[PDB]
Ligand binder design. Structure first.
Ligand SMILES: Cc1cc2nc3c(=O)[nH]c(=O)nc-3n(C[C@H](O)[C@H](O)[C@H](O)COP(=O)(O)OP(=O)(O)OC[C@H]3O[C@@H](n4cnc5c(N)ncnc54)[C@H](O)[C@@H]3O)c2cc1C
Ligand SMILES: C[C@]12C=CC(=O)C=C1CC[C@@H]1[C@@H]2CC[C@]2(C)C(=O)CC[C@@H]12
Length: 523
């Protein structure tokens, strides 16, 4: 499947429009469905194309934490925060680079939240999760909001169409027993809201392949559904919110993107840069293709990874058996530090070192969560009764590994880490239950057996793609808009550059620029 552009005139020699809509949405992530809702709610006929047999993509896997600050939702919680406070935080991290999109992000958040909560299927609440950088306007508790838990019965036939959590989806399973939470709830509610409008068609196994141009304007796109090709006309526009290049090893190697397709937490085979490709084919510029939403990943027997988040013990060594980062860093800064320290394989993989404090468990949240016994049969993890035997089994220098652990244990006994300042930040302390020691993030590694887990450079999607303006319009290298073409989420180059400012920025940006694209199409 290549994403070459089809000219209207050339197609007129043979075929014709299968269907017509005002707004064609490609993808069914948080952005896609927010854009679809915005379009359909104000009377525009809308078609949503999902490539796979399940709506939601990585947005479904998410915890549905959303960085939409200064809204009616944080007002109800009485949060000491504002549009201007969130605007300062972004300015302090990102600078003047993309300041117009920074302004539009923070200024439009309130309207996106107000439009969505109006729908009986949608309600959010503030949930504490710290912002990720020391800077003016940081919220030590967070300012991010989450959809309310959703009883799958309230949405009928849509619950079985929603992609399940990673602990189910990569083991051939559907939703696990309780309610829909995190991204399952975000996608269930957005699907039900889009459907409530009576102006939207929701399609599974409908793949975008090529955009249709007349006289340089996008007028529609051919979508493959069940062996047959269809030609869908879009009177107002095509919103492309179909994710990034995360699943395409060839586009990543070409762009110089660190990590690997097989380490991405995107749904296997889903996000293969189809929409970025179709956008370049009609003259769209690209930026930041070497950038991803990075995270450490626990290497799996099958060669894939698990998102390692909320670290609360252990330490991490490079291939010399030495600490080189604060292991408690927010996952994107952790991942960037693995890549920066990588000297042809000294940091990728890294080795997470831990003891039996958690009964053999690795001291973090791993998504998905493979059983220790499985990692040990497979050799992704190794165990031993001594650090000397552990260094032997991993090929780590034994004397260095022993010094590293003895020095980390002295730091745990003292309650400060001289070397990397672990535990001296509200993000670091957030995940840690009280221990009987001075710093909750620093626990002496001394209760046998001892484990070494392989850590790789995973991602939560790439963040490079098509250049967009404040209204989600796709731009050519010259700054001019391609008429009828919008992109959002990881189809579009993030305003965040080399930064992951706080929880919910991927979904928050996606939802705001999808809303703004719909509004621009309404005219
Ligand atoms: C465990 C986990 C937790 C996370 N938690 C959060 C969080 O709380 N908040 C947050 O902001 N971010 C979070 N993230 C990151 C976030 O999920 C993603 O970066 C973000 O959702 C990307 O959304 P998207 O719209 O770019 O892509 P997706 O949500 O993946 O949507 C893309 C969709 O487009 C479809 N598609 C692809 N190609 C085509 C095509 N050719 N035609 C039609 N459809 C196509 C795909 O199948 C997919 O369904 C988390 C990630 C993970 C893995
Ligand atoms: C770190 C995270 C991810 C990316 C992002 O952007 C925002 C968040 C905050 C919410 C957590 C989520 C990851 C998954 C978590 C840990 C859960 O399973 C419950 C709360 C979720």
């Amino acid at each position: 499947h290549h994403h070459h552009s089809q000219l209207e005139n050339l197609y007129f020699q043979g075929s014709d429009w299968t269907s017509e809509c005002d707004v064609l949405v490609v993808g069914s992530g948080g952005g896609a469905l927010t854009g679809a809702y915005t379009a359909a709610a104000q009377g525009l006929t809308t078609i949503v194309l999902e490539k796979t047999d399940r709506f939601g993509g990585t947005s479904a896997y998410s915890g549905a934490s959303i960085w939409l600050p200064g809204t009616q939702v944080q007002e109800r919680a009485g949060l000491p925060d504002s549009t201007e406070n969130a605007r300062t935080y972004l300015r302090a991290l990102l600078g003047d680079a993309e300041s117009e999109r920074q302004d539009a992000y923070v200024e439009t958040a309130p309207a996106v939240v107000a439009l969505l909560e109006q729908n009986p299927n949608i309600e959010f609440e503030f949930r504490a999760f710290p912002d990720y950088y020391k800077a003016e306007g940081r919220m030590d508790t967070g300012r991010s909001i989450n959809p309310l838990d959703l009883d799958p019965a309230d949405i009928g036939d849509l619950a079985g169409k929603v992609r399940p959590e990673l602990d189910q989806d990569r083991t051939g399973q559907d939703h696990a027993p309780g309610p829909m939470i995190g991204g399952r709830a975000l996608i269930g509610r957005l699907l039900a809201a889009v459907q409530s409008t009576g102006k939207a068609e929701l399609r599974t196994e409908s793949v975008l392949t090529s955009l249709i141009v007349e006289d340089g304007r996008v007028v529609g796109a051919e979508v493959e559904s069940g062996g047959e090709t269809q030609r869908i006309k879009a009177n107002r526009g095509v919103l492309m919110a179909a994710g990034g290049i995360e699943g395409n090893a060839e586009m990543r190697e070409q762009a110089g993107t660190p990590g690997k397709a097989i380490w991405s937490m995107g749904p296997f085979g889903a996000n293969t840069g189809d929409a970025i490709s179709a956008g370049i084919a009609v003259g769209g510029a690209t930026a930041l293709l070497d950038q991803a939403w990075f995270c450490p990943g626990v290497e799996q027997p099958d060669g894939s990874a698990a998102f390692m988040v909320g670290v609360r013990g252990g330490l991490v060594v490079d291939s010399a058996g030495e600490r080189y980062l604060n292991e408690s860093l927010p996952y994107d800064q952790f991942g960037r530090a693995m890549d920066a320290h990588d000297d042809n394989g000294s940091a990728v993989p890294s080795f997470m070192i831990f003891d039996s404090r958690e009964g053999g468990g690795l001291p973090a949240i791993c998504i998905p969560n493979t059983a220790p016994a499985k990692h040990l049969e497979a050799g992704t993890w190794v165990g031993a009764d001594t650090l000397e035997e552990l260094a032997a089994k991993t090929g780590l220098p034994a004397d260095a590994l022993r010094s590293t652990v003895e020095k980390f244990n002295d730091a745990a006994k003292l309650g400060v880490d001289e070397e990397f300042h672990r535990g001296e930040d509200p993000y670091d302390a957030f995940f840690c239950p009280p221990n009987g020691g001075a710093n909750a993030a620093l626990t002496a590694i001394e209760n046998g057996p001892f484990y070494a887990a392989r850590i790789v450079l995973s991602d939560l999607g790439t963040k490079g793609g098509l250049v967009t303006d404040v209204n989600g319009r796709v731009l050519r290298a010259d700054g001019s808009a391609i008429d009828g073409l919008y992109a959002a989420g990881n189809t579009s180059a993030s305003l965040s550059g080399r930064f992951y400012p706080g929880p919910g920025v991927p979904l928050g940006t996606a939802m705001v620029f999808s809303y703004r694209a719909a509004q621009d199409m309404a005219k």
